[PDB]
């Protein structure tokens, strides 16, 4: 995640193993139950896309759901690209590039790039955009997996 250091700057720090394991354990115990979404939200505080793929990729089991989510993440990403067209002409030397759906999904962007966008002024909340897609896709799952 990207956290604020004592000095008063935003720097990246790694997520903790008993945080990781707590994510694992939630999924083990409460599967598709709604409490998973606030839980997720708390444990995703200050998290990167990269950390969010890590959390999704580290799941075991419920592979039908994991595939449905993936496909929702790509749909929501396809929709990001649709709604926000690429911008006019070449990229400025003085500036950094606008993200695509795949940069938001973490796929085409690097960590330093993910830190550029979030730490820069104005900052862009690429975590929160992926977060809604995850929560939206979580609703899809919850609604389906209701019996």
């Amino acid at each position: 995640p990207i956290v604020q250091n004592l000095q008063g700057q935003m720097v990246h720090q790694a997520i903790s193993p008993r945080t990781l394991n707590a994510w694992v354990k939630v999924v083990e115990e409460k599967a598709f139950s709604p409490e998973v979404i606030p839980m997720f939200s708390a444990l995703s505080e200050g998290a990167t896309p990269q950390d969010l793929n890590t959390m999704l990729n580290t799941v075991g089991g419920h592979q039908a759901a994991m595939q449905m989510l993936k496909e929702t993440i790509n749909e929501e990403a396809a929709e990001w690209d649709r709604l926000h067209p690429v911008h006019a002409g070449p990229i400025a030397p003085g500036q950094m590039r606008e993200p695509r759906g795949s940069d938001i999904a973490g796929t085409t962007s690097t960590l330093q790039e993910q830190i550029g966008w979030m730490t820069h002024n104005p900052p862009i909340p690429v975590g929160e955009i992926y977060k809604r897609w995850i929560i939206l896709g979580l609703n899809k799952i919850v609604r389906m997996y209701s019996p």
């Binding site: 419920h62 592979q63 039908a64 994991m66 595939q67 449905m68 496909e71 899809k140 389906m144």
Partner: protein, 74 residues
């Protein structure tokens, strides 16, 4: 176990089968286009006659929530 060896039982819910499919698909490393081909093809083909019948009625263009809700009583 190979992906061709993944098949739906005569009493096995489709759901439990689809889970097995994307787990084994999860251990295939092929190009996405090939894996798309596997998705639309092999899944239905090794599905049981009762659900297979059901899935033929959904036609093409169908998505996983609709397939998964379509073969639920079977």
């Amino acid at each position: 176990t190979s992906i061709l060896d993944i098949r739906q039982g005569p009493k096995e819910p489709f759901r439990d089968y689809v889970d097995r499919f994307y787990k084994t698909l999860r251990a295939e490393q092929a190009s996405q286009e090939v894996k798309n081909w596997m998705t639309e093809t092999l899944l239905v083909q090794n599905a049981n006659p009762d659900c297979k019948t059901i899935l033929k009625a959904l036609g093409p263009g169908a998505t996983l929530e609709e397939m998964m809700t379509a073969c639920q009583g079977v």
